[model samples]
Target: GDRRVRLIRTRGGNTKVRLASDTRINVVDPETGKVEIAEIRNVVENTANPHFVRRNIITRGAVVETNLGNVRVTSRPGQDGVINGVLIRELEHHHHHH
Candidate 1:
């Protein structure tokens, strides 16, 4: 699916609302129980469309890279207005090493 954006004019001014996708996400570390804001490095894969992976579209079930590490997204950014995901692996190893 193609990533789409909707433009709206509020009393303040114009703003762009993501209607179908996003490029940033919120990563959650269950071990320490902390949530950190992270940028989406790229889309690892998309079950619905392979193209989405190439374009780096953030969607549910998509794997994304963050400062914390790569994570598998579990929430819908377009609808939920936020991205939430679980750490993939490195964070787990790092946690145990400390």
Candidate 2:
């Protein structure tokens, strides 16, 4: 929350914003269309590429650990300038022996 945003002036005469030391991501709660802010814990895995996960990069469809739970990224970090993920519903984990 205290991190400063960084921007770049590309050759195309455009300003590109990038994430700078931020650990918060925008999470869209399931069963509804609501946006929630959550704390990013760590990178779980990247489905598109291996290096992305190895490099700890967050991208669309990528998995990230957060306070709510493991969220699937929906924003492009490199281009979107932030981490926006969709919160996935977790299955039941209680004991149910009959």
Candidate 3:
């Protein structure tokens, strides 16, 4: 399923999500200005800390699996509401240009 975007009566700027989570990491693919969807099942990497910052932990480059592809995140878990990220560790097929 895909995510949705919603707005408040006064606090507009909402991206209504169809199926959501407590701290979801929504994404707007090459589509631009539209969120696909966000889910868990992620992997992380951070040199800032010596030990594991913990799972359920989020770094600037928070990596998570999306509905169709894998998403690597940027900062801004709040205030900005949604964040920007790229695709990585994709298990799907990508034959590339022949």
Candidate 4:
């Protein structure tokens, strides 16, 4: 069992990952003092809003409008002062068919 977690990012102007395993992600869950496996699912590319709450934020959801575009996001397993899960969204800057 020598496996470890690694963070990687794709090449693009619209990709910005705020958390990296090697970069020390803190947690506030006393029962689970450390973060284990966090997974994000069913991401709506053009409508998914991804935000990083470094020290656990208590929230159901929030939207972050960037120069890239608008993103709708949802969070879970609240701890109020730790980073538990993450999701990212992307879209073409000129594709406005909706």
Candidate 5:
């Protein structure tokens, strides 16, 4: 399977996905709650058209397995219309505790 865009539409409008270059968008049927790697781009896109009001379920909890490691994504309301943004995680290891 190759990379594709997962279109999520809410009451407002379409929620365009933003992702890392190496990251791939999988298919998650919000209606059926089925998550699968997008194999057929045209078929999936046609089926999951934005205007249909179908939300990308995977967008909420998309765990992208990247070269850096597993990246747990949480949906964020972007400025223009982007929906998916990885909420920055600050790992604090050094703490004064003795």
Candidate 6:
């Protein structure tokens, strides 16, 4: 169900050149100003195709879930070989102290 990508090693060390569409994403939290790795729960939307939404593919502007909360993808994993996203603010149903 998951795709496997080749690993590359150099003087800088080792890194993944490619990865499955369901690979974990790196999310940056604006509130705490921290970066954390998160799992791909589901694809909220996709400008490319409606099918991609249901397929849960990682694409720019796609919404994903993390241990902290939901976030929006800002990096192109398919092209950049890395996943990065920004936290998605929650609805104004309740107020936060901090």
Q: Mind giving the per-residue lDDT tens digits that candidate 4 earns over 1-95?
A: 96544332432343345423221122223344443333232133334333432332223454332222333333443232223432223345567
Clashing pairs in 6: none
Models ranked on TM-score:
6, 2, 1, 3, 5, 4
The TM-score of candidate 5 is 0.22
Clashing pairs in 4: 49-71, 49-72, 55-81, 55-82, 56-81, 56-82
* Tens-digit lDDT track of model 5 for 1-98: 97665454222223343532122333344445545432211112223343444233334454433222233444432332333323212222365221
User: Candidate 1 residues 1-98, lDDT tens each?
Assistant: 97664332222223344422335567888677668866665464543323323464566676676667778888877555767888777334537421
What clash count goes with each model? 0, 0, 6, 6, 0, 0
Per-residue error for 42 in candidate 2, Å, reads: 1.4
Instruction: Give the best candidate by TM-score.
Output: 6
**Model 5 residue 96 lDDT?**
27
Question: What lDDT score goes with residue 41 in model 4?
Answer: 27
In candidate 6, how many Å is residue 52 off?
13
Model 6 compared with the native: what TM-score?
0.55
Q: Give a tens-digit lDDT track for model 3, residues 1-98.
A: 75543321232234566323334556656545556545543333432322433255555666655544667776555546655465555444676311
Q: Candidate 1 deviates by what RMSD? A: 10.9
Name the regions of candidate 2 deviating beyond 4 angstroms: 1-18, 46-55, 90-98
Per-candidate alpha-carbon RMSD to the true structure? 10.9, 12.9, 13.0, 15.3, 17.1, 11.2
Q: Give me the runs in candidate 3 sitting further than 4 Å from their true place.
A: 1-21, 31-34, 44-54, 94-98
State the displacement of the C-alpha of residue 51, model 3, in Å, after optimal TM-score superposition: 17
Task: Give stretches of model 5 more than 4 Å off.
Answer: 1-58, 76-98
lDDT of 6 by residue, 1-86 (tens): 66544332222223443446346677888778788876655454433323324465566776665555668888887655658888
